[PDB]
Design an enzyme around this catalytic site. Structure first.
Site, PDB file in Angstrom:
ATOM      1  CG  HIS A  42      -1.722   1.236   1.409  1.00 41.31           C
ATOM      2  ND1 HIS A  42      -3.093   1.278   1.273  1.00 41.31           N
ATOM      3  CD2 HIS A  42      -1.338   2.494   1.734  1.00 41.31           C
ATOM      4  CE1 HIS A  42      -3.518   2.508   1.501  1.00 41.31           C
ATOM      5  NE2 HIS A  42      -2.473   3.265   1.781  1.00 41.31           N
ATOM      6  CD  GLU A  43       1.508   3.272   3.912  1.00 41.72           C
ATOM      7  OE1 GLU A  43       1.413   4.252   3.142  1.00 41.72           O
ATOM      8  OE2 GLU A  43       0.792   3.132   4.927  1.00 41.72           O
ATOM      9  CG  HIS A  80       0.403   6.184  -0.868  1.00 37.90           C
ATOM     10  ND1 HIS A  80      -0.651   6.883  -1.416  1.00 37.90           N
ATOM     11  CD2 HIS A  80      -0.094   5.551   0.221  1.00 37.90           C
ATOM     12  CE1 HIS A  80      -1.738   6.676  -0.696  1.00 37.90           C
ATOM     13  NE2 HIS A  80      -1.427   5.871   0.305  1.00 37.90           N
ATOM     14  CE1 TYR A  94      -3.845  11.270   2.443  1.00 42.57           C
ATOM     15  CE2 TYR A  94      -3.578   9.906   0.497  1.00 42.57           C
ATOM     16  CZ  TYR A  94      -3.849  10.029   1.842  1.00 42.57           C
ATOM     17  OH  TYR A  94      -4.121   8.908   2.589  1.00 42.57           O
ATOM     18  CD  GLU A 111      -5.105   6.009   1.424  1.00 42.40           C
ATOM     19  OE1 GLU A 111      -5.581   4.902   1.755  1.00 42.40           O
ATOM     20  OE2 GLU A 111      -3.923   6.345   1.647  1.00 42.40           O
ATOM     21  CG  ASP A 166      -9.391  10.536   5.921  1.00 37.99           C
ATOM     22  OD1 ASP A 166      -8.210  10.425   6.312  1.00 37.99           O
ATOM     23  OD2 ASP A 166      -9.908   9.766   5.083  1.00 37.99           O
ATOM     24  CG  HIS A 196      -7.379   7.114   4.795  1.00 37.10           C
ATOM     25  ND1 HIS A 196      -6.811   8.268   5.288  1.00 37.10           N
ATOM     26  CD2 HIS A 196      -6.357   6.365   4.320  1.00 37.10           C
ATOM     27  CE1 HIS A 196      -5.501   8.218   5.119  1.00 37.10           C
ATOM     28  NE2 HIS A 196      -5.200   7.074   4.533  1.00 37.10           N
TER      29      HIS A 196
HETATM   30  N1  LIG Z   1      -3.974   4.421   7.369  1.00 38.96           N
HETATM   31  C1  LIG Z   1      -5.260   5.015   7.727  1.00 38.96           C
HETATM   32  C2  LIG Z   1      -5.866   4.314   8.946  1.00 38.96           C
HETATM   33  C3  LIG Z   1      -4.884   4.072  10.082  1.00 38.96           C
HETATM   34  C4  LIG Z   1      -5.601   3.639  11.352  1.00 38.96           C
HETATM   35  C5  LIG Z   1      -5.874   4.820  12.269  1.00 38.96           C
HETATM   36  N2  LIG Z   1      -4.614   5.393  12.823  1.00 38.96           N
HETATM   37  C6  LIG Z   1      -5.106   6.506   8.009  1.00 38.96           C
HETATM   38  O1  LIG Z   1      -4.024   6.983   8.352  1.00 38.96           O
HETATM   39  O2  LIG Z   1      -6.063   7.271   7.901  1.00 38.96           O
HETATM   40 ZN   LIG Z   2      -2.509   5.321   2.207  1.00 42.31          ZN
END
Ligand SMILES: N[C@@H](CCCC[NH3+])C(=O)O
Ligand SMILES: [Zn+2]
Ligand SMILES: O[C@@H]1[C@@H](O)[C@H](O)OC[C@H]1O
Ligand SMILES: O[C@@H]1[C@@H](O)[C@H](O)OC[C@H]1O
Ligand SMILES: O[C@@H]1[C@@H](O)[C@H](O)OC[C@H]1O
Ligand SMILES: CC(C)[C@H](N)C(=O)O
Ligand SMILES: [Ca+2]
Ligand SMILES: [Ca+2]
Ligand SMILES: [Ca+2]
Ligand SMILES: [Ca+2]
Length: 316
Positions: A142-143, A146, A157, A166, A226, A231
């Site tokens: 996943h990362e 990015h 983003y 995402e 967010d 997300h």
């Molecule tokens: N990776 C997601 C969820 C992480 C879980 C909550 N810290 C985010 O940063 O929004």
């Molecule tokens: Zn991500």
């Protein structure tokens, strides 16, 4: 560091034994010279100064609990690299075999991982919500996905372009999980999420609603939290992808699946040929539709399935 390329052994976060490519020069450093210009793993030592110290080990054996996050981050980074090389003919995230650097033991009880524009950063988790996040191959891929986006489509983003960004990382993090084929599913982070709750995950591409995320453009989050719900609204594009590959009926619209491999080829081409920093969902549909046409023709089942999937989630 300069040295001789050798192979060590260790156990990962989940207690699995695996080999890792290392470099010997007094110590055995986590430096994988067999992949591009290198995959380097570092030790943030529970602090936030990055990258930290290139992981050094005295005997090439990494079976200590403290070594595990570095093992998975070092090992699963190479798996993702191999995925992009073997499957998409891409050499690392910038296409020119850029070095892949990951730092583990980030801060204390940090329940997250991220790509900071230059490297990957994994927290160990507070032991309740998360364990070390490098343990999840989908997390790792996943990362690093990015990074692939930053160098290709460059999706901002925030808002729809961020959700697509995402969603791309969720998609290719899942396809890498399949490419490795070790308990692969359409869930996100199951291997490192809540060790004391059996069967849950952070997100769900199959059923985004399972965890409160939209699976249709009507239910999209429009607030500001967010970064606009990148997300959150990723579920809409996750579901669409899950339908393209696996097929099904969603809000009465029926989608014929074409398989994971074709989903991958379609979305990668969209991410690298047709998406732009300000792409939105409707533009993503068009990007996927053109990709499927270049790859399989306008009158193909693949193109139909894409149109059917984005219809099912309310994306026109
Ligand atoms: N990776 C997601 C969820 C992480 C879980 C909550 N810290 C985010 O940063 O929004
Ligand atoms: Zn991500
Ligand atoms: O126990 C840890 C050890 O595994 C590592 O090698 O150095 C730091 C210590 O905290
Ligand atoms: O080992 C400890 C670690 O678990 C915590 O994250 O920070 C303090 C350290 O001593
Ligand atoms: O997000 C919701 C969840 O909290 C509930 O438990 O089941 C239905 C979901 O939509
Ligand atoms: C936890 C991980 C998958 C990512 N940082 C979120 O989502
Ligand atoms: Ca050792
Ligand atoms: Ca899995
Ligand atoms: Ca998964
Ligand atoms: Ca769990």
């Amino acid at each position: 560091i300069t040295g001789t390329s050798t192979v060590g052994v260790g156990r990962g976060v989940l207690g699995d034994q695996k080999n890792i490519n290392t470099t010997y020069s007094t110590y055995y450093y986590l430096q994988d010279n067999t992949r591009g210009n290198g995959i380097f793993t570092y030790d943030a030592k529970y602090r936030t100064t990055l990258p930290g110290s290139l992981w050094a080990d005295a005997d090439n054996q990494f079976f200590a609990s403290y070594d595990a996050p570095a093992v998975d981050a070092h090992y699963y980074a190479g798996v993702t690299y191999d995925y992009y090389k073997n499957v998409h003919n891409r050499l690392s995230y910038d296409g020119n075999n850029a070095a892949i650097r990951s730092s583990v033991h980030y801060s204390q009880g940090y329940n997250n991982a991220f790509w900071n524009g230059s490297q990957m950063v994994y927290g160990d988790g507070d032991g309740q919500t998360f364990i070390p996040l490098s343990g999840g191959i989908d997390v790792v891929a996943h990362e690093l996905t990015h990074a692939v986006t930053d160098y290709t489509a460059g999706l901002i983003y925030q808002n729809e372009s961020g959700a697509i960004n995402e969603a791309i990382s969720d998609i290719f993090g899942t396809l890498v999980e399949f490419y490795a084929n070790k308990n692969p599913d359409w869930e996100i982070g199951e291997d490192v999420y809540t060790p004391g709750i059996s069967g849950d995950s952070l997100r769900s591409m199959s059923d985004p609603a399972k965890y409160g995320d939209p699976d249709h453009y009507s239910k999209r989050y429009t607030g500001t939290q967010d970064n606009g719900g990148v997300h959150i609204n990723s579920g809409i594009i996750n579901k669409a992808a899950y339908l393209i590959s696996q097929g099904g009926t969603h809000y009465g619209v029926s989608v014929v699946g074409i398989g994971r491999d074709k989903l991958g080829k379609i979305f990668y081409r969209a991410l690298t040929q047709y998406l732009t920093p300000t792409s939105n969902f409707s533009q993503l549909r068009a990007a996927a539709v053109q990709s499927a046409t270049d790859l399989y023709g306008s009158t193909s089942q693949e193109v139909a399935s894409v149109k059917q999937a984005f219809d099912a989630v309310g994306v026109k």
